[PDB]
Symmetry: C3
Subunit: 268 residues, 3 copies
């Protein structure tokens, strides 16, 4: 109760004494943003293992300038499939709030479950379906937000419009769709992929949804994109999903996805 | 196992010596029943915090239109951090008191376009998307390992309720309640999904109690106040707890009238 | 650290079993519903009670080694269900022990409620795919000794085994169905709305087991064959219909001869 509040304050205080303190946007460097940390100038690098109460995982907080703009980046992320509690997965988001972060940008890798979404496509996330445990289960922390937060437009529409404009300017094709969050860590069966596609999902991944719920609970505006890293449909007789193939697609998308996120930061 | 049994008995004993003892119907005073407790006569009020093993709210014993009732004022939700054992503990205590019928109301978001704000929905079935409350060693004293859920919502109660509503000139809807944990409200994609697969309203309660009631052979009647519409979202629409409560409060007179008459009819 | 201790537990269970079993089995069978006559068909049995095997979940249950359908086998008589309160680690622990024994193939049966109107009480369904609605058993740090962090599940139910089983069923004149198994936790049976939902999104039968073991088997490269006995129909409910564990058991028992005949012929073919 009071201990929980204290833990948030301790992490925030530790980071606040170290970071530039001018960032208003935080970015989770998920799949597809693998080139972005290198682009941050005048880096202050703070290992996760040094920050009070951050889950034991590299993992670094990186402060600096990206796209001409102050940023805080989360290099490394905590996934529910790794055994972290939802409190651990989402702890850094509430720390960002205490630092004065107003906006959260996030990327991830996802399997396409709508046939218009192909390997290598970059999908702006317009909505999600949560099939992981809700991270807000437990006593409400009033310091962060209300008991029953609204999720009608969890993915900020103005950020979406700006990102579409940026993609057009940069001549980068983008798709837009619904992200379905599952725990994993096994990839889905064809029956599962089909089910989620049938009920309106466009891509499926194992992250992001918990952070988005927690961000929205505390009023942070969210922009998210998925790299479509694999196609969960039209399976060849010998098709196998493979982490190295997912990473191949994530790596291949990083330049262009990174260009969008880097241009978006100054626009928000 | 034997300690669990003790705990149920300890809570039941505590209430047993403090309540009249003839009540056959229990009521969870959820959203839409906010005026009913006032109408209970010859009240015995027992705070939850005094009842052995109740999660850390009142039990109200009394007479509602000539009929002895036990009412639960305040309820435990999974989104609060309670275990399912804690959420549903009072239902098993009710069974030990000789309760035969459970009446329950809740607030729910409409996910079928024929369910609108202010509508009173008789629950005819549910879809459970919370953890099943019976996971764990079966409590043989309460029921069997694999309880049937074919007609979890008693058909005779539904018929009676419909007759009562017609008589009182209160329109009612009937439909499927989908239970989710919350506590955040759903996204449009989630609302659309649950509507697509046959849900009519979505809420964050009730399902665990109904599973536990049916496990021990308690007959169930449930209604939802449709407190918000999870469809056709305006560009600036936001869900808001105070607006949900507004609809619950506005529904309380008429919903309470139905429940009060049903209590007398069973 | 914690990995060390977990690896040690699997090794302890496997060492205990390997000092006692014949050691020639490549196929293990979970004796679920529909296989209630199969243990008696195993010849030259070595019976090892679960309560003697290091780290097997507490309760009867036995590992049985011997010969079935002319072929070495290890059978799991008794299984652990998530609805009983076991962790997924406990539910699936025996599967990883099988891997350490050199088991390459896992055959599994279960009971399930039909949710496609083509699937009727007493039908024998070859499982061609599943939908998992129980907690994923691999959540937690990955055990590299068993498999990779993100295992593929594209053909969790081996297509070659399915083809062999269909051929066997034809030869033996036993009709079979084929379809998608939906795994739910239970332990309460589903509501009609739930049965309808799962049917709508492509499930053919619903049960409370099997999926966790299949995920863990595939994580460690074990080839899987599964069948469900359709023990009840989760559709077209009569006004007075009730699901009943006793009716499920009767149907499972009634299917056991023909289901067992398929599994016994399949073991030599794989």
């Amino acid at each position: 109760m009071k201990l929980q509040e204290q833990h948030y304050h301790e992490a925030a205080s530790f980071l606040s004494s170290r970071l530039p303190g001018d960032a208003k946007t935080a970015i989770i460097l998920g799949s597809g943003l693998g080139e972005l940390a290198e682009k941050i100038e005048n880096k202050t690098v703070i290992p996760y293992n040094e920050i009070p109460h951050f889950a034991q995982a590299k993992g670094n907080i990186i402060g600096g300038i990206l796209g001409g703009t102050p940023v805080v980046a989360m290099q490394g992320r905590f996934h529910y499939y790794e055994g972290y509690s939802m409190d651990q997965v989402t702890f850094p988001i509430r720390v960002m709030k205490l630092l004065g972060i107003e906006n959260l940008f996030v990327s991830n890798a996802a399997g396409g479950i709508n046939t218009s979404f192909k390997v290598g496509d970059l999908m702006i996330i317009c909505d999600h379906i949560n099939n992981l445990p809700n991270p807000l289960i437990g006593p409400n922390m009033d310091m962060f937000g209300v008991r029953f937060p609204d999720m009608t437009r969890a993915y900020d529409r103005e950020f979406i419009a700006k990102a579409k404009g940026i993609a057009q300017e940069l001549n980068i094709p983008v798709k837009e769709g619904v992200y379905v969050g599952l725990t994993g860590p096994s990839y889905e069966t064809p029956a599962e992929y089909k089910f989620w596609g049938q009920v309106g999902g466009d891509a499926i991944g194992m992250s992001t949804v918990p952070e988005v719920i927690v961000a929205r609970h505390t009023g942070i505006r969210v922009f998210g994109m998925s790299v479509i890293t694999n196609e969960g449909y039209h399976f060849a007789d010998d098709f196998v999903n493979d982490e190295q193939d997912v990473i191949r697609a994530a790596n291949a998308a990083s330049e262009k996805m990174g260009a969008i996120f880097a241009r978006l930061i100054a626009a928000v």
